[PDB]
Amino acid sequence: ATHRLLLLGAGESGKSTIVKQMRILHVNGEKATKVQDIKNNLKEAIETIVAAMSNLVPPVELANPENQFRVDYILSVMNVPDFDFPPEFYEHAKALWEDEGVRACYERSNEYQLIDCAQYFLDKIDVIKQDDYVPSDQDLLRCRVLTSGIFETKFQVDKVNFHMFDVGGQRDERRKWIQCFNDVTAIIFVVASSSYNMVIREDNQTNRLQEALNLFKSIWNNRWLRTISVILFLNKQDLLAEKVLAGKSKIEDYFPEFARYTTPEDATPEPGEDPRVTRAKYFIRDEFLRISTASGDGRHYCYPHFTCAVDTENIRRVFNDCRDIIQR
Amino acid sequence: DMMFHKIYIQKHDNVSILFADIEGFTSLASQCTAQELVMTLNELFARFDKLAAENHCLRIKILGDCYYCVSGLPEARADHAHCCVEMGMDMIEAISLVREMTGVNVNMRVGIHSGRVHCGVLGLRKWQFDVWSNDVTLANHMEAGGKAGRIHITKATLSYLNGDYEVEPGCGGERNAYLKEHSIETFLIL
Amino acid sequence: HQSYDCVCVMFASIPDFKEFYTESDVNKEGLECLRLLNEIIADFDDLLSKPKFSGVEKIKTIGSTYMAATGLSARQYMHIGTMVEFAYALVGKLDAINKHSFNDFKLRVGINHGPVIAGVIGAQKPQYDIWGNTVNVASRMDSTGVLDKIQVTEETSLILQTLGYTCTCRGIINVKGKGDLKTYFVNT
Ligand SMILES: C=C[C@@]1(C)CC(=O)[C@]2(O)[C@@]3(C)[C@@H](O)CCC(C)(C)[C@@H]3[C@H](O)[C@H](OC(=O)CCCCN3CCN(C)CC3)[C@@]2(C)O1
Ligand SMILES: Nc1nc2c(ncn2[C@@H]2O[C@H](COP(=O)(O)OP(=O)(O)OP(O)(O)=S)[C@@H](O)[C@H]2O)c(=O)[nH]1
Ligand SMILES: Nc1ncnc2c1ncn2[C@@H]1O[C@H](CO[P@@](=O)(S)OP(=O)(O)OP(=O)(O)O)[C@@H](O)[C@H]1O
Ligand SMILES: [Ca+2]
Ligand SMILES: [Cl-]
Ligand SMILES: [Mg+2]
């Protein structure tokens, strides 16, 4: 009746977020700490966007010469330890945030390292500053904090117990995955579908998907895990779709094969979903299917599910879609 | 069993761990031919191996001039601390014969902690019973941070003792790193 | 039990380990690590079976330090050469573990040769383990070596040099009982 269920993925794949929902969904209140945490993310984002406008090629000129002093303001605060968050900050954040040349630099975000609660929280500053404010669940799900360590969540669905194991999703953090490899029922590998134009932090060279592609491989072909079948969450489906539709940067450019690609017969396209979006979300699935397929020996199998983490409505659905397969 | 090799290890609790070393051993080492040395060593050690049984300690291993044993293995005991004590007790007594029987000033340096362990065997070939945990390292690091022909003991090993023993501050932190650095209160025995 | 002449002693430790040893509710009080030590130490003993190492004989593992010898089966010095090819082959074994443990482990070899004894100590558990100066040194070679290289003695170095091996002098090293003396690393 008990299911030691370990949770893997690259950096910022979306793990402690799925952890998040399982708690939202299946577990029984002074979030006042998590506010401070949100606040932090705001600084973090805006500093990071201004920062690289200069650092970029081409460089990126502020829409409004006025904002230049605000720029200056920001980086005069950038490394402060215990920050106090005075009201000017938000006036100046919003300002830069309003600046079109800033928002045009946002458009080149794939070209440097930036958290994906960016737009979302920047879009809602005024709400954040009110000292009576309490974060929506949406907001609370997006507060991003480095996972240094490993954390045991435990829950129950229809009196069936779960043991969620969260790991550090970065290079130096994977040395300690092993400790979860024995006495594991099955795996959740979480992947940031949308990060096909970006490189990872660890070196700032390796393409994030490509990284996670050949992390998958290293697990699906692992010595202590030829039994254990792996549930793949193709995470971040909203963002993905967005980029595809946005059409701005082409996929085949980042993964040259997409160009020879056509669209799968078992195609189960979301209702009203775009045929070109449908192409990529699956195509990406099939880059992982070329790994799961190419070995394992009908001795374990791959469960691919398109997912958005920050979507309890999609999450419950796919977790149901999952408690299911634990039976077998 | 089909993907990890089977693991011959069992967690154990409330066990006293001992380490002991030979002060100024290399003075003896330079003295005697590799042969007639081995003898005096294999001598004392089998005697140590013996008191062990008297004192209720499963011996672990010999690592050159280093000996170590434990109390609470294989099977639990309440007196567990007292045993590893009564062991050290007999060992400096024992080694004193070998001071007379040679003439060189070779002696001992005990160190004893009490905590959790692990125990069993590793790999496939040539098994030897063994123990592992910080608590263990700690005992070892107290063989390191001991003083000659005096028995060393921790915070914990006092607590499993019920002061039937007269003792005093060793303050081992001023001998060995790991002690100091981990806030360790050490004691000697009278 | 009895003495000997030309026994070659090797120690190989993995010093990256003493850190990696955690204890937590999550890692069952330090056992899940002991699990990986097992998966390695084993992977190493798997090498004894090898035909070309039929001559190699493991003695004991000390914490995560491996100990094994060529010679007790009796050009004439082939057995030292042998051993070194053993050491290297654990590194093959080890880079297999890293691969799958998402980790980085280097090996720390000390090696040597000369007068040893090879008997049984204490009646209570009678165990095969070798004494002698010769040995203590192969241990100094470990404890004072370098990750990912093999550090060997002045005597040893020559012999290995007499076998299509190349070497480099690390310099001078203290031994508590044997003063200061020249040591060497093999070149890959
Ligand atoms: C492997 C896990 C871990 C952390 C657990 C543990 O308790 C140890 O196995 C002890 C303490 C423990 O098993 C008791 C024996 C011994 C052999 C002392 C071990 C080693 O020191 C290990 O470290 C090593 O493998 C390298 C250090 C060896 C240093 N020793 C010091 C004592 N002299 C006599 C020999 C060399 C050890 C610390 O490693
Ligand atoms: N837009 C969008 N954002 C997501 C989605 N999933 C997660 N995020 C956001 O991106 C970040 C990634 O989630 P998080 O759990 O922190 O990554 P992670 O994989 O756990 O990071 P690590 O533990 O592997 S190092 C989070 O801050 C979360 O707000 C998604 O499906 N869509
Ligand atoms: N057969 C064996 N098995 C395991 N360890 C052994 C061994 N033979 C030697 N060693 C270890 O080899 C290491 C090096 O020994 P030093 O060169 S530091 O001599 P010292 O005796 O410590 O000198 P002191 O400080 O005056 O007592 C030691 O841990 C031995 O136990
Ligand atoms: Ca010693
Ligand atoms: Cl990813
Ligand atoms: Mg996380």
Q: How far is the CA of C136 from the centre of ligand 3 (A)?
A: 6
Please tell me the distance in Å from C16's CA to the nearest CA on chain A.
Answer: 12
Structure tokens at A197: 């134009």
Contact A177, C102 (CB under 8 A): yes
CA distance A44 to B96: 68
Whether the CA torsion A99, A105, A109, A115 is positive or negative: it is negative
Whether the CA torsion B81, B83, B88, B89 is positive or negative: it is positive
HEC letters along C83-107: HHHHHHHHHHHHHHHHHHHCCCCCC
Q: What is the DSSP letter of C76?
A: -
Residues 6+ apart with CB under 8 A from B81: B16, B71, B114, B157, B160, B161
Whether the CA torsion A265, A269, A272, A274 is positive or negative: it is negative
Domain ranges for chain B, please list them: 1-190
Residue B180 has φ and ψ, to the nearest 5°, of -30, -70
- Report the residue of C101, C103, C105 to disrupt the A interface, i.e. the one with the largest count of A CBs within 10 Å: C101
B5 near A CB under 8 A: no
The domain of C11 spans: 1-188
Specify the pairing of strand C167-175 against strand C179-186.
antiparallel
| Strands lying side by side in the sheet with A302-307 | A150-156, A161-167, A2-9, A186-192, A230-235, A302-307
Q: What is the DSSP letter of C52?
A: G
CA distance A211 to A234: 14
- Residues C124-160 as b/e (b if ≥16 CB within 10 A, e otherwise) read ebebbbbbbbbbbbbbbbbeebeeebbbbbeebbebb
Around A88, how many Cα atoms within 13 Å sit in the side-chain half-sphere? 8
Omega within 30 of 0 (cis) for the link into A264: no
Does A179 sit within 8 Å of C27, measured CB to CB? yes
Length in residues, chain A: 328
| A1-31+147-328 CATH fold | Rossmann fold (3.40.50)
Chain mean position to CA B182: 20
Task: Show residues of chain B in contact with A224, CB under 8 Å.
Answer: 3-4
Annotated binding site of C for ATP: 60, 129-131, 136-140, 176
In the set B17, B22, B95, B189, the catalytic residue is: B22
Largest CA distance in chain C: 55
Question: Quick check: helix, strand or coil at residue C113?
Answer: strand
Contact A126, A93 (CB under 8 A): no
- Whose tokens are 């999609």? That residue is A314
Structure tokens at A307: 């997912």
Contact A169, A8 (CB under 8 A): yes
Burial of residue A55 (number of CB atoms within 10 Å: 0-12, 13-18, 19+) = exposed
Q: Which amino acid is at A133?
A: Y
Q: What is the resolution of this structure in A?
A: 3.0
Determine whether the shortest distance from the Cβ of B63 to ligand 3 is under 6 A: yes
Residues 6+ apart with CB under 8 A from C114: C5, C6, C7, C132, C133, C134, C155
Residues 6+ apart with CB under 8 A from A284: A193, A196, A209, A234, A240
Closest CA to A146 of A8, A49, A16: A16
Contact C68, C86 (CB under 8 A): yes
Closest CA to C70 of C5, C112, C8: C8
Pocket of ligand 1 (CB under 6 A): B 63, 66, 130-133, 136-137, 140; C 13, 17-18, 21, 62-65
Pocket test for ligand 1, best of C11, C13, C16, C18 (most atoms within 8 A of CB): C18
Question: Quick check: helix, strand or coil at residue C31?
Answer: helix
- H helix or E strand, kind and range, residue B169: strand B167-169
CA distance A174 to B98: 53
Which residue pairs from A118-125 have beta carbons closer than 8 angstroms and sit at least 24 positions apart in sequence?
Answer: A118/A45, A118/A49, A121/A38, A121/A41, A121/A42, A121/A45, A122/A42, A122/A45, A122/A46, A122/A93, A122/A97, A125/A42, A125/A90, A125/A93, A125/A94, A125/A97
- Residues B102-114 as b/e (b if ≥16 CB within 10 A, e otherwise) read eeeebbbbbbbbb
Number of compact structural domains in chain C: 1
Around A284, how many Cα atoms within 13 Å sit in the side-chain half-sphere? 31
Residue A287 has φ and ψ, to the nearest 5°, of -70, -30
Contact A56, A111 (CB under 8 A): yes
Around A197, how many Cα atoms within 13 Å sit in the side-chain half-sphere? 18
CA distance A302 to A325: 11
Count of CB atoms situated within 10 Å of the CB of B169: 9
Q: How far is the CA of A310 from the centre of ligand 5 (A)?
A: 15
- Whose tokens are 């905590």? That residue is B115
Around C121, how many Cα atoms within 13 Å sit in the side-chain half-sphere? 25
Q: What CATH number should be reported for the domain holding residue C173?
A: 3.30.70.1230
Closest CA to B46 of A81, C167, A244, C125: C125
Contact B190, B167 (CB under 8 A): yes
Please tell me the distance in Å from A12's CA to the nearest CA on chain C.
Answer: 18
Question: Quick check: helix, strand or coil at residue C40?
Answer: helix
Which residue pairs from A287-294 have beta carbons closer than 8 angstroms and sit at least 24 positions apart in sequence?
Answer: A287/A209, A287/A213, A287/A255, A287/A257, A288/A191, A288/A213, A288/A216, A288/A232, A288/A234, A291/A213, A291/A216, A291/A217, A291/A220, A291/A221, A292/A220, A292/A230, A292/A232
Around A257, how many Cα atoms within 13 Å sit in the side-chain half-sphere? 10
Beta bridge partners of C180: C174
Burial of residue A26 (number of CB atoms within 10 Å: 0-12, 13-18, 19+) = middle
Structure tokens at B64: 């050159």
Beta bridge partners of C130: C118
CATH number of the structural domain B1-190: 3.30.70.1230
Structure tokens at C169: 């002098």
Residues 6+ apart with CB under 8 A from A195: A12, A208, A209, A212, A236
Structure tokens at C92: 């093959």
The closest CB to that of C23, out of B122, B128, B134, belongs to B134
Q: To which CATH superfamily is domain A32-146 assigned?
A: GI Alpha 1, domain 2-like (1.10.400.10)
- Whose tokens are 């006042």? That residue is A32
Omega within 30 of 0 (cis) for the link into C126: no
CA distance A58 to B152: 69
HEC letters along chain A: CEEEEEEEECCCCCHHHHHHHHHHHHCCCCCHHHHHHHHHHHHHHHHHHHHHHHCCCCCCCCCCHHHHHHHHHHHCCCCCCCCCCCCHHHHHHHHHHHCHHHHHHHCCHHHCCCCCCHHHHHCCHHHHHCCCCCCCHHHHHHCCCCCCCEEEEEEECCCCEEEEEEECCCHHHHHHCHHHCCCCCEEEEEEECCCCCCECCCCCCCEHHHHHHHHHHHHHCCCCCCCCCEEEEEECHHHHHHHHHHCCCCHHHHCHHHHCCCCCCCCCCCCCCCHHHHHHHHHHHHHHHHHHHCCCCCCCCEEEEEECCCCHHHHHHHHHHHHHHHCC
- Whose tokens are 């799900």? That residue is A141
Q: What is the DSSP letter of B2?
A: -
Largest CA distance in chain A: 64
Closest CA to B58 of C31, C127, C124: C124
CA distance B22 to B108: 5
- Which residues precede a break in chain A, with C-to-N distance above 2.5 Å? 28
CA distance C165 to C154: 14
Contact B153, B167 (CB under 8 A): yes
Structure tokens at C53: 């190492």
Contact B3, A225 (CB under 8 A): yes
Burial of residue A34 (number of CB atoms within 10 Å: 0-12, 13-18, 19+) = middle
Count of CB atoms situated within 10 Å of the CB of A201: 13
Burial of residue A276 (number of CB atoms within 10 Å: 0-12, 13-18, 19+) = middle
CA distance A215 to A236: 18
Contact B34, C133 (CB under 8 A): yes
CA distance C34 to C66: 15
Closest CA to B4 of A228, C39, C98, A180: C39
Around B95, how many Cα atoms within 13 Å sit in the side-chain half-sphere? 23
Domain ranges for chain A, please list them: 1-31+147-328, 32-146
CA distance A133 to A42: 15
Structure tokens at B96: 């004193």
Contact B83, B57 (CB under 8 A): yes
CA distance A14 to A272: 26
Experimental method: X-ray
